[PDB]
Design a protein around this nucleic acid. Structure first.
Ligand SMILES: C[S@@+](CC[C@H](N)C(=O)[O-])C[C@H]1O[C@@H](n2cnc3c(N)ncnc32)[C@H](O)[C@@H]1O
Lengths: 128, 178, 262, 238
DNA sequence: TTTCTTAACATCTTAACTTTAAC
DNA sequence: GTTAAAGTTAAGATGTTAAGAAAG
């Protein structure tokens, strides 16, 4: 019987490829291949940034980069990524919340609803 | 341009072409470090973006010939060599560069011509000590150059990082001024 | 579209060179029973360019009465013959590693290879319209070179000559080059990069290994352009510095030591 | 320079907003399932060959495919020039010594198949030797003739002749005469466009598809353009 | 004293880019 | 205001060799 190439590829990538190249299910991670080498935002990086948003101060990316990250991440990268989380293009109004991690999705949904009502969806980021 | 591909392919020069100021800085720099010391030209830093190949070809264009080995580790005046290469008529050139259409170079002829060019076109110690290269600050990103920081080879992330760095530079400049 | 007027342009420029005859001193003719077991030191010395025009009896050629690759190890190229120079040889697919290994055993070192890419004469003629004697092949070559603009609308890949071979169909011939140093103090003069390592040529499908006239001229001109001091200038050089093995009995190159198998 | 500086700051903020919106659109596309150019059935390995555990590759290939690879494509990072050249080619990747390319367990990775190792003119002889001492019989050579976008020959530079082609040496190891491998196919010439530094033609892959249809292949030195279906690819920038 | 790495060395072609004369 | 027609530049998977870092 001929070998199923999709299943064979899934098994090979799950067994012996990197965590960024493959996924938990074994499907190919297109996100790693649509970004430059080294400039990839792993889910671990996003989880670390989400931890540092309310573990540390929003805006003080020196402390978040040195402590929560390994000190090898761009400050502009971190600011842009938390802009993605907050759903807004200006995190200046949200400087230093530091209350709890369990409502970041809540303010994201609030910004999404505001953009939908004010016709400022703009690829899931409310324009301010 | 496709930014998804690997960095090994599509080698570029960042800075595309040679300007008047850049060629004047190269003329000044070849007279202090010497022709051929491209590592020492770039290491001190006066060519923001030019590769070794660009500086090599620009030196060839400056002297009017591609026989750069006659000026290896040697500081001379660029104008006289260009004048003497433009003066002679029984030569064949492409891109205004004189080509050795005769025999291949030899090791002894190299030393003899190096000594001869040092004697003829060489500069004194006063002219060597007179030249001053533009001292660029080492805490400066790609300042201004809105047509060179908006490069297709860069991603959106890299372009935005450059823009934020430059914006912080004007912020620091206004803080110093104010 | 296919730019065949440029890859085949050399056929309109490289004129074949008339032989200088044995009576004149511009060329030397050497007749031996077989070349690979002949002491070639008496036929020349201080050589610079050796061109073994060997046709190999490979299994791909359909019994064309060539040369065994095992007999080349019997060749004797001493330091007296060539001290610092370049050897040019014809190589096939299944004996390429054999040639390289035997040359490395001789004292030579691989430097470069020069490929002739083959365009089918029959395919080109078929695209123009829609056993062959050598004069008919030459006439058809002239016809296809004259009416090449009409051939500009056909893709190159549909004009390539794909000949029988067990693994990948043959479409090229290869001329390997090897270099002998001897003593690094004496340097062999060269004109580098003066012609490309790949050329395009229309050939017949019967035996593309045997390169005809007006194509051996391209290889000759590449050899003389690569080695300028290897040319025989009459009156100021004593001995010929260029030598061909397995040369034609009618075309003696003016400036070469031709060795004929007879 | 104050009013001009204010205008420059306003233009910088406008470009910041524009590129921020572009980045947001790109990453929203990525989050909402943006298919990349590499096909689904590819195995990209981002590892250094001197430190890569090839035994993992062999064990998983036996566990999943049931047979070793039928074709190995190699285009090694030869020592030719540096990343900052003075005169010519500008090879922007880490060179490997010939001993390191020799030390790969290629003989322990294949049982019957084809090596497709690319070579340069300086490393042609050592490529033949590498094929020889890997237990293989060099039998074929495919010349990729580089083509300009207009249709000419993309002539490069050399020391004896102007290099305008690349040689991929193909060797066999064992049983090929069985029905898996097709004989007398394709051609030894790839007249195709030069589309990047050390960028091999796409057509060679189809030639492999014409040689061993529906087979397992491995690319030992591969970049992000070398991923294909049914191809295991290894590299340091994958 | 011997060898190993880096930099710099020329002899070439073609497309892309830039500049310029002409309708 | 375009247009086609030269200059110009970088890019290309060269081998070789003088000049030291490094082991004697
Ligand atoms: C010549 S490139 C392959 C290019 C490919 N043929 C194409 O068509 O794009 C070989 C790659 O091997 C990678 N490489 C270099 N050194 C390596 C090492 N030590 N281990 C693993 N991969 C390495 C580099 O990324 C280099 O670009």
């Amino acid at each position: 019987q001929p070998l199923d190439f999709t299943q064979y590829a899934k098994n090979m990538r799950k067994d012996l490829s990197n965590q960024d190249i493959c996924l938990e299910d074994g499907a190919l991670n297109h996100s790693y291949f649509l970004t430059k080498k080294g400039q990839y935002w792993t889910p671990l990086n996003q989880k670390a940034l989400q931890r540092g948003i309310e573990l540390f101060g929003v805006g003080n990316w020196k402390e978040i980069n040195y402590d929560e990250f390994s000190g090898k991440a761009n400050i502009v990268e971190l600011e842009l990524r938390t802009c993605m989380i907050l759903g807004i293009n200006d995190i200046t109004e949200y400087y230093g919340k530091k209350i709890s991690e369990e409502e970041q999705e809540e303010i994201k949904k609030s910004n999404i609803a505001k953009g939908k009502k004010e016709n400022k969806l703009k690829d899931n980021i409310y324009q301010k | 341009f496709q930014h998804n591909q690997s960095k090994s392919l599509w080698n570029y020069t960042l800075s595309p072409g040679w300007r008047e100021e850049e060629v004047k800085i190269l003329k000044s720099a070849l007279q202090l470090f010497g022709i051929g010391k491209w590592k020492k030209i770039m290491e001190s830093g006066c060519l923001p973006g030019k590769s070794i190949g660009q500086i090599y070809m620009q030196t060839q264009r400056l002297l009017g010939q591609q026989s750069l080995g006659d000026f290896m580790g040697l500081q001379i005046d660029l104008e006289a060599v260009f004048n003497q290469n433009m003066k002679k008529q029984d030569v064949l050139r492409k891109n205004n560069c004189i080509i050795n259409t005769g025999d291949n170079p030899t090791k002894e002829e190299r030393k003899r011509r190096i000594e001869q060019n040092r004697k003829i076109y060489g500069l004194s110690a006063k002219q060597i000590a007179e030249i001053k290269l533009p001292k660029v600050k080492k805490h400066a990103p790609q300042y201004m150059t809105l047509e060179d920081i908006e490069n297709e080879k860069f991603t959106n992330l890299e372009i935005l990082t450059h823009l934020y760095n430059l914006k912080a530079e004007i912020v620091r400049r206004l803080a110093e001024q104010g | 579209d296919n730019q065949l007027s440029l890859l085949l342009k050399w056929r309109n420029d490289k004129i074949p060179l008339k032989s200088a005859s044995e009576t004149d001193n511009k060329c030397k003719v050497v007749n031996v029973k077989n070349i690979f077991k002949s002491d070639l030191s008496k036929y020349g010395a201080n050589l610079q360019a050796l061109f073994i025009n060997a046709l190999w009896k490979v299994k791909s050629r359909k019994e064309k009465e060539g040369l065994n690759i095992n007999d080349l190890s019997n060749l004797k190229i001493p330091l007296s013959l060539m001290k610092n120079g370049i050897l040019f040889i014809w190589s096939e697919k299944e004996i390429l590693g054999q040639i390289v290994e035997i040359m490395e055993q001789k004292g030579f070192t691989y430097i470069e290879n020069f490929s002739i890419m083959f365009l089918g004469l029959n395919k080109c003629l078929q695209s123009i319209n829609h056993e062959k004697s050598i004069e008919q092949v030459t006439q058809e070559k002239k016809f296809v070179m004259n009416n090449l603009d009409i051939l500009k609308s056909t893709d190159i890949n549909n004009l390539f000559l794909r000949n029988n071979y067990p693994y990948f169909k043959k479409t090229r011939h290869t001329l390997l080059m090897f270099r002998r140093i001897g003593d690094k103090n004496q340097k062999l003069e060269l004109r580098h990069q003066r012609t490309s390592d790949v050329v395009f040529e229309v050939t017949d499908e019967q035996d593309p290994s045997k390169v005809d006239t007006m194509m051996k001229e391209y290889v000759y001109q590449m050899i003389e352009t690569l080695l300028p001091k290897a040319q025989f200038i009459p009156g100021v050089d004593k001995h010929l510095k260029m030598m061909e093995l397995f040369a034609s009995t009618d075309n003696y190159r003016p400036g070469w030591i031709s060795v004929i198998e007879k | 320079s104050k009013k001009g500086l204010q205008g420059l700051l306003q233009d910088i903020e406008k470009r910041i907003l524009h590129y921020k919106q572009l980045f947001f659109k790109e990453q929203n596309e990525i989050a909402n399932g943006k298919r990349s150019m590499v096909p689904d059935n590819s195995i990209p390995i981002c590892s250094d060959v001197t430190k890569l555990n090839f035994q993992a590759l062999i064990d998983a290939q036996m566990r999943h495919a049931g047979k070793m690879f039928d074709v190995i494509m190699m285009d090694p990072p030869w020592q030719l020039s540096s990343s900052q050249p003075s005169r010519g080619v500008a090879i922007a990747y880490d060179s490997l010594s010939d001993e390191k390319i020799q030390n790969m367990p290629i003989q322990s990775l294949q049982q019957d198949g084809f090596i497709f190792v690319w070579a340069i003119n300086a490393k042609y002889r050592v490529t033949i030797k590498m094929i020889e001492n890997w237990g293989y019989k060099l039998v074929d050579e495919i010349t990729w003739v580089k083509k300009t976008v207009n249709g000419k020959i993309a002539k490069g530079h050399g020391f004896y002749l102007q290099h305008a082609k690349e040689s991929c040496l193909i060797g066999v190891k064992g049983d090929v005469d069985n029905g898996r491998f097709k004989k007398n196919i394709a051609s030894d010439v790839i007249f195709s466009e030069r589309r990047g530094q050390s960028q091999k033609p796409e057509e060679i892959y189809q030639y492999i598809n014409q040689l061993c249809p529906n087979g397992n292949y491995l690319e030992i030195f591969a970049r992000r353009n070398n991923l294909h279906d049914n191809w295991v690819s290894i590299g340091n920038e994958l």
